[PDB]
């Protein structure tokens with residue numbers, strides 16, 4: 060229980076450092092934020108993605124395993140889980156729309172890269188996990204048998220999409236650093252290169268912590284009567 | 285059992301398509317292979333990495349869950365598991381040495397990228413899982429209690445390193461396509477862009493299949509007496 064406390068502690072810390080490093084990076088090293096820059100608008104993409112898709116979803120994934128909720132309502136924890144994932148969906152759609160906007164405005168191509176393919180798959184599958192999850196596990200009419208055999212799929216899919224999102228983030232960082240750090244070139248180890256690489260590792264470690272927490276059987280929410 | 289057969293079937297298929305797509309890509313679209321090209325030598329990197337690190341390790345990770353081995357020796361299955369992971373280590377070290385060689389020969393920088401940071405971490409941790417795994421679980425002198433509490437770490441770490449390796453592969457593809465596809469630019473959807481993006485997705489799906497297989501409790505190797 061207290062070693063769980065230390066794990067949730069570390070996960071929260073690394074996660075918040077991921078968001079801080081995202082913000083510091085776009086504000087300091089890049090040009091900033093804004094709703095038309097146009098790269099000012101683009102840099103909403105990494106910031107949103109880290110914030111909702113990696114961090115908020117990272118937390119939503121393990122919301123049920125907090126002990127101070129075990130004797131809380133299941134319908135309430137379903138509400139927190141659904142809603143937290145929902146904030147993360149909204150933010151990720153906003154983040155993808157930002158890129159489609161900066162690109163259509165600036166006459167760049169869409170969906171040519173592997174980062175966008177994987178990314179868009181993870182987004183679509185995230186909304187399918189959200190819709191099925193909401194129309195089976197929150198909603199009332201779904202027969203208990205349908206919950207019974209959707210559940211292992213739904214847990215697995217959640218972990219898979221989480222990982223895929225981490226992998227797409229690291230691909231995103233790479234694309235941005237290679238495109239942007241031309242002179243000083245990325246190869247020359249410039250300050251933004253080390254800073255962003257570190258943010259990468261933080262996003263990675265945070266994934267590792269969330270996976271550890273979420274795969275302890277001794278911290279699963281104790282089964283309902 | 286037969287739905288397991290179909291899963292191992294699909295995993296093997298997608299895995300072999302990953303290796304085929306790697307080879308077709310470096311041989312067709314790039315310049316080829318060789319032990320001094322110098323990019324001929326480099327293109328050993330993706331090919332080796334896909335082959336040993338993604339595929340051979342993908343198989344080693346689920347070797348114990350094949351039913352036709354459940355009433356086989358545990359020491360034998362430990363041998364296959366160890367040895368398969370060992371082939372994958374050898375190949376991955378060869379693959380990293382290839383890059384350090386092409387780069388030192390051609391005066392490029394080392395370890396400036398996030399793909400190399402994560403990649404090198406995954407390699408070091410893969411050799412630490414290999415050494416600890418070999419000096420606890422194959423070797424005789426390790427007290428059963430030390431196996432008892434190393435095991436959940438060791439399973440977790442294996443799954444984490446597998447995923448990290450998948451993420452580093454996708455980062456690698458991205459780097460290579462962005463560096464190499466200058467004219468026709470990657471953005472222009474050239475044939476190699478679609479082919480390699482597809483190889484990316486195959487590497488991804490293969491990871492998903494291996495994770496599904498390896499997290500079915502009904503396919504864990506039945507515990508020793």
Ligand code: HEM
Nearest residue numbers: 120123137141144185188189192193196197214217218280
């Ligand atoms: C993109 C959206 C979602 C993702 C990534 C996701 C992910 C997950 C994950 C990873 C778990 C395993 C947690 C654990 O066992 O500790 C889980 C459990 C669960 N999820 Fe979701 N989920 C999503 C949407 C939803 C929605 C909308 C609902 C609606 C009620 C829902 C209901 C549940 C339930 C009931 C559990 C079982 C909790 C337990 O007793 O351990 N999920 N989810």
Ligand code: HEM
Nearest residue numbers: 105108158159162169170172175178179227228231232235
């Ligand atoms: C991890 C979750 C992420 C997802 C799911 C995701 C998804 C996407 C999608 C669908 C696109 C295509 C948009 C378009 O074609 O206009 C895109 C573009 C892009 N993203 Fe991400 N993204 C993520 C994170 C990041 C991060 C953290 C960065 C950091 C800089 C980044 C950098 C880029 C860049 C440079 C592009 C345009 C180049 C391209 O089309 O590949 N992405 N992303």
Ligand code: HEM
Nearest residue numbers: 345348362366369410413414417418421422439442443505
């Ligand atoms: C990089 C090297 C390695 C990786 C990635 C790795 C990965 C894994 C994974 C993912 C599992 C879980 C499989 C399952 O539960 O179905 C596992 C199980 C196991 N591994 Fe390893 N392993 C490595 C090295 C070794 C070595 C050298 C040994 C030496 C004997 C070993 C011994 C075992 C044992 C005994 C099990 C339990 C099998 C069972 O009864 O289910 N591992 N390994």
Ligand code: HEM
Nearest residue numbers: 330333383384387394395397400403404452453456457460
């Ligand atoms: C997935 C497992 C992989 C691992 C663990 C890995 C690891 C590494 C390491 C440690 C380096 C640094 C070598 C040096 O600095 O000279 C490197 C470089 C490189 N790798 Fe990978 N690699 C992997 C897969 C791939 C794949 C599939 C490609 C496909 C083209 C690729 C493309 C590159 C490129 C272009 C470089 C040089 C640029 C750089 O330093 O980032 N890698 N890799």
Ligand SMILES: O=C1O[C@H]([C@@H](O)CO)C(O)=C1O
Nearest residue numbers: 133195196197206207208210
């Ligand atoms: O609706 C639900 O389904 C799961 C599980 O019981 C499925 O077997 C769960 O925790 C609910 O409250």
Ligand SMILES: O=C1O[C@H]([C@@H](O)CO)C(O)=C1O
Nearest residue numbers: 098101162167234235238239
């Ligand atoms: O976000 C991007 O960065 C590069 C380039 O615009 C930098 O000048 C690019 O092509 C993107 O899509």
Ligand SMILES: O=C1O[C@H]([C@@H](O)CO)C(O)=C1O
Nearest residue numbers: 358420421422431432433435
């Ligand atoms: O050496 C071993 O340790 C594990 C497990 O028993 C640990 O509890 C296993 O399968 C062995 O043969």
Ligand SMILES: O=C1O[C@H]([C@@H](O)CO)C(O)=C1O
Nearest residue numbers: 323326387392459460463464
């Ligand atoms: O493997 C590589 O591809 C590019 C470049 O060499 C292509 O001309 C680069 O810098 C690498 O390290």
Ligand SMILES: [Zn+2]
Nearest residue numbers: 101161162167
């Ligand atoms: Zn852009």
Ligand SMILES: [Zn+2]
Nearest residue numbers: 326386387392
């Ligand atoms: Zn090179």
